[PDB]
Amino acid sequence: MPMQMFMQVYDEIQMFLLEELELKFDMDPNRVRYLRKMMDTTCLGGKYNRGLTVIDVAESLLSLSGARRKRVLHDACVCGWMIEFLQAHYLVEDDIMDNSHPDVTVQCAINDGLLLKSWTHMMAMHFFADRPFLQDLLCRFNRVDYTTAVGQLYDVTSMFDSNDFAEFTLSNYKRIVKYKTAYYTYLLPLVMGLIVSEALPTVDMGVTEELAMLMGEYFQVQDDVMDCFTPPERLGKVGTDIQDAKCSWLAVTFLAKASSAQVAEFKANYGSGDSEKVATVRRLYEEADLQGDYVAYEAAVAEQVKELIEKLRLCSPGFAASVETLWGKT
Amino acid sequence: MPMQMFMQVYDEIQMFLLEELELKFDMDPNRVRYLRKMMDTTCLGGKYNRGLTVIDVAESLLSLSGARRKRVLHDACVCGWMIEFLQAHYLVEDDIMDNSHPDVTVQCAINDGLLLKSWTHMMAMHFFADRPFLQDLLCRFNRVDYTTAVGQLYDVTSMFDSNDFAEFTLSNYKRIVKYKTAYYTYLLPLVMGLIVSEALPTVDMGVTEELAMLMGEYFQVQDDVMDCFTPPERLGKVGTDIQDAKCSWLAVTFLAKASSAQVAEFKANYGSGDSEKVATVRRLYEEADLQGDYVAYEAAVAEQVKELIEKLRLCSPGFAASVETLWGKT
Ligand SMILES: Cc1nccc(C(=O)N(C)Cc2c(F)cccc2Cl)n1
Ligand SMILES: Cc1nccc(C(=O)N(C)Cc2c(F)cccc2Cl)n1
Ligand code: NA
Ligand code: NA
């Protein structure tokens, strides 16, 4: 039911946006079908983890606060697609970076990124036009989007001096995860479910924020280990953190427990595209027993998560019963 | 006074944004100074035509409707910088297209473009937090921003079939000018001046929209002719419309009055980087007496502008006395 309903609302949102362009923006059919194909290509196909969470939060809050049910669930579906379109916008922005007379493909990619972001506003301004939360929804959405761009700056420049391994620390790694990922992937869907369920001021936002940051940290650490050790045909992509000199959990944990000569061997091999230098880094990770530390670190984070949900149910029992699927889905 | 006041409010907006990052987004001083330099580089140095217009509209409306004066003028200055930051965002997006291991300059440019746009929201959400128009201001701003991205699509794909000279027509040229430029350069500053002056529903928006589109058309036609005939050291850049096969006023006017063999000569030479093919196109423009038609076309547009301002003063005399500088500044 949630996935089926989420996909029906997608057709409703797409048709509004495309008809709006045809009827109010003077768009010709060729470009309308061009934009329908682009929207499907960039927004569909993922797992919809962020979008379906808005639904799951909304349905749990109308079970413990007729027509109010139908409207809230539909509102949650629009909010879910706002985040999905936002995610598609971020992915298109990423494709422009690694992809490299007017090159019309780079022009259209930049145009795609601007349209996907604007569509989050257009669908909000339309389907929520008569909602009292429309102004608060836009402000929280815009602020979280700003947060993500700030975290991208922290990530992209973690190895330099914005006009290097000093910023390879656990607290900075958490700062990167916090802003680059956790706020829009974990905090934003939860907040949006609360907004459409009219239960925003009824929850402890501090414990909510703290949970979202902890869950983003847990899933980024797992992502970092898989990026390095999971082979490409099983990970789904090519792990490139070592070559890209990312401030990953493996790097900052290694630098703390490595010897001075191992740090020199790591610093001399990190951030290179050569096959043997990357393998030299993986060898250092293995010999430092990092995957042994990975299990303990995740377990400790899991314990902080498995216990912070309890502080939240004492004032919001249904809300905490929506984050129940944080471990019904890893 | 307007320029001096506009620049003081810039310092106020910059300091808020940078302190917000330092105090609420955990940003380190090195990156704060990096962002101060980026903000100055991208937002300052232009002519501030869009931003100062919000001020000029605001000061004319408090002369024919104490503390309300000071607040409205300051609000107009923030709205002016929203458009300037929006313009800087569009320029950065343009630099990414023509500029072409993780290339950190392309990553930072994309990051710059996201930050400049988000800053328009952050300064609005802060300085207008207690204003009743904050929700309407954001929606009109977001819609105009969406409009511009749609016009960029019309422009960038004017010579192809979105998966060619059929779309080289006067009505499509106006459609490109309308969405790509006129809405955010001419309509948006006027609307924003009305919003902060609490005089939005007091003006004929139709004549206002019609004037903004006509003034954008006039200045784009003049821009198109200068791009082709004004030498680079006098234009300020290198005119590249012929090489880029832009749907310019010269091209669509030429295609209407050229002979079948001249059209073939134009089609065989348009959109090339070769020195002689570009000069062949300029030769065709000269022999078709296009610069003779340019004077008449601008004069006719000027007459429509010099007369549409009168329809607006019969219900908004002070407003039309703000667009007076449309010809006190060409
Ligand atoms: C890509 C990815 N990897 C792992 C998890 C997620 C995710 O956000 N989920 C599963 C939904 C979710 C949420 F939106 C907010 C708070 C908790 C949760 Cl569980 N996404
Ligand atoms: C780059 C450029 N070239 C020519 C004109 C402008 C411009 O927008 N001006 C001068 C301000 C302005 C406005 F914001 C709204 C309506 C009318 C006017 Cl006159 N900008
Ligand atoms: Na998702
Ligand atoms: Na301007």
XYZ file of C-alpha atoms and ligand atoms in Angstrom:
702
model
C 0.000 0.000 0.000
C 2.670 2.640 0.846
C 4.745 1.990 -2.285
C 1.648 1.715 -4.481
C 0.261 4.958 -3.041
C 3.645 6.690 -3.329
C 3.840 5.830 -7.032
C 0.279 6.979 -7.757
C 1.043 10.367 -6.190
C 4.143 10.494 -8.394
C 1.917 10.343 -11.476
C -0.245 13.086 -9.965
C 2.749 15.327 -9.238
C 4.371 14.702 -12.622
C 1.168 15.466 -14.525
C 0.621 18.717 -12.635
C 4.188 19.899 -13.232
C 4.146 19.014 -16.934
C 0.693 20.480 -17.541
C 1.752 23.594 -15.617
C 4.658 23.996 -18.049
C 2.382 23.401 -21.046
C -0.424 25.697 -19.874
C 1.384 28.406 -17.867
C 4.982 28.375 -19.177
C 4.297 28.077 -22.930
C 6.212 24.803 -23.281
C 5.983 22.840 -26.531
C 5.102 19.112 -26.487
C 8.582 17.986 -27.596
C 10.164 19.588 -24.536
C 7.345 18.385 -22.263
C 8.037 14.781 -23.246
C 11.757 15.513 -22.926
C 11.161 16.657 -19.343
C 8.881 13.709 -18.555
C 11.681 11.343 -19.585
C 14.288 13.308 -17.606
C 12.092 13.350 -14.500
C 11.538 9.581 -14.675
C 15.242 8.916 -15.291
C 16.489 10.995 -12.363
C 13.702 10.512 -9.796
C 12.614 6.880 -10.269
C 14.625 3.689 -9.894
C 16.111 4.237 -6.443
C 14.835 2.695 -3.214
C 12.771 5.723 -2.062
C 14.030 5.273 1.507
C 13.690 8.987 2.288
C 10.284 9.423 0.661
C 8.574 6.356 2.120
C 9.728 7.420 5.598
C 7.485 10.493 5.478
C 4.578 8.125 4.817
C 5.550 5.716 7.609
C 5.849 8.593 10.090
C 2.488 10.010 9.001
C 0.514 6.767 9.292
C 1.857 6.071 12.790
C 0.793 9.506 14.069
C -2.828 9.324 12.901
C -3.102 6.067 14.886
C -2.426 7.916 18.163
C -2.748 11.708 17.948
C -12.178 10.324 8.063
C -11.064 13.108 5.740
C -8.083 14.157 7.872
C -6.578 10.716 7.247
C -6.760 10.940 3.449
C -5.339 14.473 3.282
C -2.425 13.858 5.664
C -1.346 10.703 3.822
C -1.497 12.548 0.494
C 0.435 15.473 1.989
C 3.050 13.017 3.256
C 3.346 11.586 -0.258
C 4.033 15.025 -1.728
C 6.631 15.712 0.978
C 8.221 12.350 0.227
C 8.582 13.287 -3.428
C 10.064 16.662 -2.491
C 12.954 14.840 -0.809
C 13.258 12.342 -3.674
C 13.396 15.206 -6.179
C 15.919 16.902 -3.896
C 17.997 13.713 -3.880
C 17.782 13.532 -7.680
C 18.952 17.153 -7.790
C 21.998 16.271 -5.668
C 22.801 13.251 -7.846
C 22.671 15.308 -11.054
C 24.985 17.852 -9.424
C 27.373 14.975 -8.682
C 27.274 13.721 -12.284
C 28.386 17.142 -13.540
C 31.551 17.024 -11.414
C 32.889 13.654 -12.591
C 31.789 13.920 -16.241
C 34.827 16.163 -16.834
C 31.797 24.946 -28.821
C 28.868 24.794 -26.364
C 28.593 21.294 -24.909
C 24.822 20.827 -24.912
C 24.931 17.822 -22.565
C 26.653 19.778 -19.780
C 24.212 22.646 -20.356
C 21.240 20.291 -20.091
C 22.639 18.581 -16.988
C 23.008 21.912 -15.185
C 19.512 22.778 -16.398
C 18.262 19.428 -15.061
C 19.723 20.185 -11.639
C 18.009 23.571 -11.499
C 14.664 22.124 -12.623
C 14.669 19.270 -10.100
C 15.255 21.677 -7.216
C 12.631 24.138 -8.472
C 10.136 21.285 -8.831
C 10.352 20.675 -5.072
C 9.119 24.240 -4.571
C 6.474 24.094 -7.312
C 4.868 20.903 -5.996
C 4.932 22.316 -2.452
C 3.466 25.685 -3.467
C 0.647 23.872 -5.308
C -0.465 20.895 -3.208
C 0.097 22.766 0.084
C -1.244 26.154 -1.047
C -4.052 26.088 1.551
C -2.018 24.472 4.300
C -0.971 26.559 7.325
C 2.418 24.796 7.419
C 3.424 25.768 3.863
C 5.628 28.636 5.056
C 7.258 26.578 7.813
C 7.689 23.618 5.455
C 9.520 25.757 2.886
C 11.810 27.315 5.500
C 12.805 24.003 7.096
C 13.265 22.506 3.627
C 15.420 25.410 2.423
C 17.504 25.343 5.606
C 18.159 21.602 5.312
C 19.109 22.120 1.663
C 21.515 24.859 2.782
C 22.887 22.473 5.414
C 23.656 19.867 2.748
C 25.549 22.355 0.576
C 27.610 23.353 3.615
C 28.415 19.705 4.317
C 29.450 19.227 0.696
C 31.978 22.020 1.230
C 33.298 20.284 4.356
C 33.613 17.013 2.425
C 35.096 18.290 -0.846
C 37.747 20.373 0.940
C 38.625 17.939 3.742
C 42.163 17.403 2.370
C 43.168 20.996 1.528
C 43.270 24.592 2.799
C 40.391 26.534 1.225
C 42.031 29.564 -0.399
C 46.631 17.475 4.179
C 45.389 15.352 7.103
C 44.794 17.853 9.928
C 41.014 17.588 9.481
C 41.116 13.763 9.428
C 39.536 13.447 12.866
C 36.507 11.658 14.271
C 34.700 14.871 15.224
C 35.240 16.368 11.768
C 34.113 13.128 10.131
C 30.914 13.419 12.167
C 30.616 17.061 11.103
C 30.833 15.973 7.462
C 28.293 13.175 7.942
C 26.050 15.498 9.975
C 25.696 18.229 7.359
C 26.386 16.381 4.098
C 24.004 13.484 4.694
C 22.256 13.056 8.040
C 20.164 16.242 7.993
C 18.417 15.630 4.659
C 18.441 11.815 4.648
C 17.350 11.139 8.243
C 16.217 14.312 10.021
C 14.282 15.864 7.129
C 11.894 12.937 6.397
C 11.082 12.605 10.102
C 10.442 16.340 10.487
C 8.317 16.364 7.329
C 6.185 13.487 8.590
C 5.613 15.445 11.797
C 4.663 18.588 9.861
C 1.955 16.985 7.717
C 0.739 15.108 10.818
C 0.417 18.407 12.747
C 2.621 16.959 15.512
C 5.774 19.076 15.150
C 5.755 20.782 18.599
C 4.792 17.516 20.346
C 8.168 15.745 20.046
C 11.547 16.263 21.698
C 13.454 17.643 18.717
C 16.784 17.341 20.526
C 16.551 13.566 20.868
C 15.120 13.512 17.337
C 18.080 15.489 15.976
C 20.472 13.347 18.013
C 18.958 10.134 16.639
C 19.118 11.330 13.027
C 22.793 12.262 13.392
C 23.599 8.926 15.046
C 21.766 6.913 12.388
C 23.505 8.853 9.620
C 26.854 8.161 11.272
C 26.107 4.429 11.555
C 25.132 4.132 7.894
C 28.067 6.244 6.679
C 30.587 4.101 8.575
C 29.068 0.964 7.051
C 29.098 2.684 3.654
C 32.769 3.620 4.072
C 33.833 0.057 4.878
C 31.839 -1.390 1.972
C 33.281 1.214 -0.403
C 36.731 -0.239 0.329
C 36.171 -3.984 0.836
C 32.975 -4.909 -1.016
C 33.958 -5.833 -4.606
C 32.363 -3.707 -7.340
C 29.911 -6.312 -8.667
C 28.489 -6.661 -5.131
C 28.666 -3.033 -3.967
C 26.893 -1.791 -7.107
C 29.611 0.713 -8.058
C 33.389 1.103 -7.957
C 34.649 2.083 -4.519
C 36.819 5.158 -4.991
C 37.298 6.722 -1.530
C 41.007 5.848 -1.344
C 41.725 7.329 -4.781
C 39.626 10.416 -4.007
C 41.366 10.861 -0.626
C 38.030 11.016 1.168
C 37.885 11.658 4.909
C 36.400 8.217 5.491
C 35.912 6.316 8.731
C 38.702 3.919 7.754
C 41.226 6.727 7.259
C 40.554 8.595 10.509
C 40.430 5.380 12.558
C 43.652 4.140 10.955
C 45.542 7.381 11.616
C 44.768 7.123 15.333
C 46.137 3.590 15.834
C 48.881 3.435 13.182
C 52.589 3.706 13.892
C 54.634 6.666 12.693
C 56.141 4.623 9.856
C 52.718 3.262 8.876
C 51.301 6.801 8.778
C 54.143 7.743 6.429
C 53.315 4.712 4.278
C 49.638 5.697 4.347
C 50.339 9.354 3.544
C 52.607 8.326 0.662
C 49.929 6.059 -0.854
C 46.633 7.814 -0.085
C 44.826 9.784 -2.765
C 46.443 8.061 -5.752
C 44.875 6.297 -8.710
C 47.642 3.712 -9.029
C 46.501 0.129 -8.501
C 49.262 -0.809 -6.053
C 49.070 2.329 -3.897
C 45.333 1.767 -3.395
C 46.059 -1.867 -2.513
C 48.806 -0.674 -0.167
C 46.167 1.384 1.658
C 43.777 -1.581 1.843
C 46.638 -3.699 3.187
C 47.275 -1.133 5.931
C 43.572 -1.145 6.842
C 43.592 -4.949 7.076
C 46.754 -5.143 9.188
C 45.385 -2.520 11.594
C 42.350 -4.774 12.263
C 39.995 -1.953 11.287
C 37.157 -4.318 10.377
C 37.473 -5.632 13.921
C 37.008 -2.087 15.219
C 34.161 -1.560 12.739
C 31.943 -4.116 14.492
C 32.508 -2.582 17.925
C 31.998 0.995 16.711
C 28.715 0.097 15.002
C 27.587 -1.865 18.063
C 28.249 1.126 20.321
C 26.381 3.413 17.921
C 23.562 0.864 17.722
C 23.328 0.843 21.524
C 23.075 4.638 21.563
C 20.365 4.358 18.895
C 18.532 1.428 20.514
C 18.324 3.547 23.698
C 17.716 7.085 22.411
C 14.456 5.890 20.834
C 13.230 5.249 24.385
C 13.727 8.857 25.496
C 11.482 9.825 22.561
C 8.564 7.458 23.235
C 7.980 8.806 26.759
C 6.488 11.931 25.134
C 5.821 10.649 21.580
C 5.024 6.919 21.607
C 3.784 6.732 18.019
C 6.744 8.712 16.689
C 9.301 6.323 18.190
C 7.177 3.499 16.751
C 7.956 4.961 13.321
C 11.739 4.963 13.770
C 11.258 1.294 14.711
C 12.168 0.456 11.102
C 15.600 2.040 11.504
C 16.565 -1.544 12.382
C 13.720 -3.152 10.455
C 15.845 -1.887 7.567
C 19.633 -1.446 7.646
C 22.398 57.668 -0.886
C 20.851 54.579 -2.582
C 24.205 53.057 -3.563
C 25.775 53.943 -0.210
C 22.807 52.442 1.647
C 22.779 49.368 -0.606
C 26.442 48.684 0.176
C 25.997 49.137 3.934
C 23.183 46.570 3.920
C 25.526 44.266 2.002
C 27.946 44.339 4.937
C 25.028 43.628 7.273
C 23.818 40.673 5.194
C 27.313 39.251 4.704
C 28.131 39.442 8.413
C 24.895 37.704 9.388
C 25.419 34.885 6.886
C 29.056 34.332 7.867
C 28.378 34.519 11.601
C 25.423 32.163 11.113
C 27.810 29.644 9.537
C 30.353 30.132 12.332
C 27.838 29.965 15.189
C 25.112 27.622 13.878
C 26.823 25.529 11.166
C 30.135 24.777 12.931
C 32.247 26.440 10.232
C 35.957 27.010 10.845
C 37.504 30.472 10.297
C 39.527 29.396 7.238
C 36.358 28.429 5.381
C 34.493 31.507 6.654
C 37.122 33.782 5.123
C 37.077 31.580 2.020
C 33.326 32.174 1.728
C 33.648 35.906 2.423
C 36.071 36.183 -0.502
C 33.835 34.069 -2.761
C 30.764 36.134 -1.880
C 32.571 39.401 -2.653
C 33.986 38.019 -5.914
C 30.660 36.772 -7.268
C 28.211 39.349 -5.869
C 30.134 42.647 -6.029
C 31.588 44.452 -9.028
C 28.549 44.526 -11.302
C 26.242 47.501 -11.819
C 23.521 46.387 -9.347
C 20.804 47.421 -11.812
C 18.356 44.822 -10.480
C 19.053 45.470 -6.802
C 18.930 49.270 -6.873
C 15.578 49.085 -8.686
C 13.920 47.573 -5.611
C 15.143 50.614 -3.676
C 13.965 53.105 -6.311
C 10.515 51.488 -6.407
C 10.296 51.504 -2.606
C 11.235 55.161 -2.114
C 8.706 56.331 -4.714
C 5.841 54.468 -3.016
C 6.389 55.880 0.479
C 6.116 59.356 -1.092
C 2.502 58.682 -2.145
C 0.891 55.664 -0.465
C 8.717 57.688 10.635
C 9.632 54.092 11.421
C 7.744 52.606 8.461
C 10.110 54.499 6.154
C 13.297 53.073 7.677
C 12.030 49.478 7.727
C 10.681 49.467 4.160
C 13.913 50.898 2.738
C 15.946 48.300 4.640
C 13.586 45.546 3.469
C 14.015 46.784 -0.103
C 17.791 46.586 0.327
C 17.594 42.952 1.427
C 15.311 42.139 -1.519
C 17.763 43.883 -3.830
C 20.580 41.676 -2.581
C 18.431 38.567 -3.013
C 18.247 39.307 -6.744
C 21.949 40.202 -6.914
C 22.838 36.927 -5.185
C 20.448 35.178 -7.569
C 22.226 36.825 -10.505
C 25.596 35.743 -9.095
C 24.200 32.212 -8.814
C 23.222 32.268 -12.502
C 26.642 33.598 -13.522
C 28.476 30.859 -11.604
C 26.233 28.287 -13.288
C 27.279 29.790 -16.631
C 30.990 29.599 -15.764
C 30.680 25.857 -15.115
C 29.363 25.237 -18.641
C 32.153 26.955 -20.589
C 35.050 25.971 -18.301
C 34.999 22.532 -19.970
C 40.954 12.580 -10.198
C 38.427 14.914 -8.524
C 38.728 18.403 -9.999
C 38.367 20.523 -6.866
C 37.721 23.743 -8.806
C 34.649 22.328 -10.569
C 33.453 20.914 -7.239
C 33.851 24.298 -5.555
C 32.145 26.132 -8.424
C 29.088 23.876 -8.193
C 29.212 24.359 -4.426
C 29.397 28.134 -4.956
C 26.283 28.039 -7.126
C 24.334 26.118 -4.492
C 25.470 28.449 -1.695
C 24.584 31.656 -3.551
C 21.043 30.430 -4.197
C 20.601 29.196 -0.619
C 21.849 32.548 0.685
C 18.879 34.260 -0.988
C 16.606 32.097 1.166
C 18.662 32.479 4.352
C 18.738 36.282 4.196
C 14.999 36.339 3.434
C 14.106 33.914 6.236
C 16.119 36.050 8.688
C 15.487 39.724 7.909
C 11.833 39.090 6.958
C 11.052 36.551 9.697
C 8.380 38.808 11.248
C 7.037 40.148 7.975
C 3.591 39.021 6.767
C 4.844 38.927 3.158
C 7.657 36.427 3.821
C 5.630 33.489 2.495
C 4.422 35.378 -0.582
C 7.914 36.768 -1.195
C 9.453 33.281 -1.178
C 6.801 31.868 -3.519
C 7.088 34.667 -6.085
C 10.881 34.462 -5.837
C 10.924 30.679 -6.297
C 8.494 30.885 -9.218
C 10.578 33.530 -10.999
C 13.673 31.394 -10.413
C 11.802 28.442 -11.937
C 10.814 30.673 -14.860
C 14.464 31.512 -15.541
C 15.504 27.850 -15.590
C 12.705 27.148 -18.070
C 13.899 29.996 -20.286
C 17.442 28.643 -20.133
C 16.076 25.385 -21.546
C 14.349 27.284 -24.363
C 17.593 29.131 -25.129
C 20.090 26.262 -24.871
C 17.976 23.964 -27.064
C 16.786 26.523 -29.630
C 18.776 24.847 -32.443
C 18.007 21.159 -31.781
C 15.253 18.625 -31.044
C 15.290 17.820 -27.317
C 15.563 14.025 -27.141
C 17.849 23.359 -36.934
C 16.083 26.685 -37.580
C 12.369 25.908 -37.142
C 12.301 27.713 -33.781
C 14.128 30.766 -35.189
C 11.028 32.954 -35.082
C 10.159 36.302 -33.536
C 7.566 34.849 -31.158
C 9.978 32.171 -29.936
C 12.730 34.761 -29.530
C 10.326 36.711 -27.322
C 9.529 33.508 -25.429
C 13.246 33.022 -24.767
C 13.727 36.644 -23.688
C 10.534 36.495 -21.604
C 11.505 33.518 -19.456
C 15.313 33.566 -19.601
C 15.763 37.236 -18.734
C 12.768 39.561 -18.488
C 11.018 37.912 -15.531
C 13.945 38.053 -13.091
C 15.719 41.148 -14.442
C 12.722 43.459 -14.941
C 9.529 42.017 -13.443
C 11.043 40.633 -10.232
C 12.666 43.866 -8.920
C 9.457 45.807 -9.581
C 7.299 43.191 -7.846
C 9.720 43.049 -4.913
C 9.619 46.819 -4.482
C 5.825 46.607 -4.383
C 5.920 43.806 -1.800
C 8.117 45.614 0.732
C 6.087 48.789 0.088
C 2.830 46.922 0.871
C 1.421 48.052 -2.497
C 1.244 44.744 -4.389
C -2.559 44.567 -4.943
C -2.726 48.286 -5.834
C -1.127 48.066 -9.301
C -2.291 46.662 -12.631
C -0.030 43.615 -12.807
C -0.959 42.956 -16.434
C 0.449 46.262 -17.665
C 3.338 45.732 -15.239
C 4.070 42.278 -16.674
C 3.647 43.633 -20.202
C 6.097 46.472 -19.537
C 8.725 44.160 -18.038
C 8.541 41.831 -21.046
C 8.759 44.757 -23.475
C 11.729 46.316 -21.678
C 13.520 42.964 -21.583
C 12.911 42.560 -25.310
C 14.271 46.046 -26.058
C 17.457 45.459 -24.071
C 17.994 41.958 -25.486
C 17.715 43.205 -29.078
C 20.260 45.931 -28.332
C 22.439 43.328 -26.608
C 22.206 41.016 -29.629
C 23.310 43.712 -32.077
C 26.210 44.797 -29.858
C 27.305 41.178 -29.404
C 27.866 41.026 -33.174
C 29.066 44.515 -34.165
C 30.620 46.097 -31.070
C 34.334 45.142 -31.036
C 35.496 43.189 -27.975
C 37.481 45.981 -26.294
C 34.333 48.158 -26.369
C 31.669 45.524 -25.650
C 33.567 44.233 -22.605
C 33.661 40.604 -23.783
C 33.973 38.578 -26.982
C 30.710 38.399 -28.902
C 30.037 34.726 -29.565
C 26.365 34.438 -30.607
C 27.176 33.505 -34.216
C 29.606 30.764 -33.163
C 27.182 29.487 -30.511
C 24.290 29.503 -33.021
C 22.139 31.543 -30.658
C 18.551 32.394 -31.573
C 19.403 36.088 -31.675
C 17.374 38.996 -33.009
C 19.763 39.321 -35.954
C 19.287 35.693 -37.010
C 15.482 35.616 -36.870
C 15.157 39.011 -38.579
C 17.625 37.975 -41.285
C 15.842 34.692 -42.027
C 12.594 36.558 -42.699
C 13.998 38.982 -45.299
C 16.808 36.915 -46.853
C 16.632 35.231 -50.239
C 16.629 31.454 -50.585
C 20.281 31.433 -51.656
C 21.240 33.780 -48.809
C 19.474 31.514 -46.302
C 21.529 28.614 -47.660
C 24.679 30.715 -47.268
C 23.600 31.634 -43.735
C 22.722 28.048 -42.797
C 26.063 26.831 -44.164
C 28.022 29.385 -42.103
C 26.034 29.745 -38.870
C 27.188 28.036 -35.696
C 30.842 27.651 -36.701
C 33.999 28.778 -34.947
C 35.896 29.498 -38.160
C 36.913 33.130 -38.594
C 35.631 33.477 -42.162
C 32.270 31.760 -41.627
C 31.517 34.118 -38.728
C 32.535 37.055 -40.931
C 30.356 35.635 -43.708
C 27.406 35.812 -41.301
C 28.246 39.397 -40.311
C 28.489 40.274 -44.006
C 25.005 38.846 -44.593
C 23.646 40.884 -41.671
C 25.199 44.058 -43.097
C 23.930 43.495 -46.642
C 20.406 42.829 -45.343
C 20.396 46.301 -43.705
C 19.585 44.747 -40.332
C 21.035 47.667 -38.371
C 18.594 49.831 -40.306
C 15.752 47.609 -39.099
C 17.238 47.626 -35.588
C 16.545 51.347 -35.137
C 12.925 51.035 -36.256
C 12.256 47.930 -34.148
C 13.659 49.579 -31.017
C 11.717 52.770 -31.752
C 8.466 50.815 -32.049
C 9.219 48.974 -28.805
C 10.136 52.284 -27.166
C 6.789 53.738 -28.255
C 4.964 50.773 -26.722
C 7.008 51.320 -23.549
C 6.664 55.121 -23.519
C 2.872 54.601 -23.674
C 2.270 51.549 -21.471
C 3.698 53.476 -18.506
C 0.703 55.805 -18.860
C -1.856 53.022 -18.410
C -0.083 52.243 -15.117
C -0.029 55.756 -13.623
C -3.819 56.158 -13.833
C -4.071 53.730 -10.888
C -0.477 53.841 -9.551
C 1.099 57.260 -10.168
C 4.129 56.731 -7.935
C 4.833 53.285 -9.380
C 5.016 54.577 -12.956
C 7.251 57.358 -11.601
C 9.692 54.607 -10.610
C 9.881 53.016 -14.067
C 10.678 56.559 -15.247
C 14.358 55.561 -15.114
C 13.802 52.826 -17.695
C 14.838 55.610 -20.088
C 16.826 57.560 -17.512
C 19.093 54.538 -17.950
C 19.403 52.459 -21.132
C 20.355 5.640 1.524
C 19.877 5.198 2.904
N 20.584 4.289 3.603
C 20.167 3.895 4.822
C 18.998 4.430 5.371
C 18.276 5.373 4.634
C 16.994 5.997 5.157
O 16.967 7.217 5.133
N 15.910 5.282 5.565
C 15.939 3.817 5.577
C 14.713 6.001 6.014
C 14.865 6.829 7.300
C 14.632 8.208 7.261
F 14.304 8.804 6.119
C 14.741 8.987 8.412
C 15.086 8.397 9.627
C 15.313 7.021 9.678
C 15.200 6.241 8.524
Cl 15.494 4.521 8.657
N 18.747 5.723 3.417
C 21.592 44.208 -17.215
C 20.516 45.271 -17.419
N 20.434 45.930 -18.591
C 19.487 46.870 -18.777
C 18.581 47.165 -17.754
C 18.678 46.472 -16.544
C 17.737 46.737 -15.383
O 17.190 45.747 -14.925
N 17.544 47.964 -14.823
C 18.214 49.149 -15.365
C 16.635 48.087 -13.678
C 15.153 47.791 -13.957
C 14.515 46.760 -13.258
F 15.187 46.027 -12.376
C 13.166 46.477 -13.471
C 12.430 47.224 -14.389
C 13.055 48.259 -15.085
C 14.406 48.544 -14.869
Cl 15.129 49.857 -15.773
N 19.653 45.544 -16.421
Na 15.473 8.291 -0.680
Na 21.544 43.529 -11.277
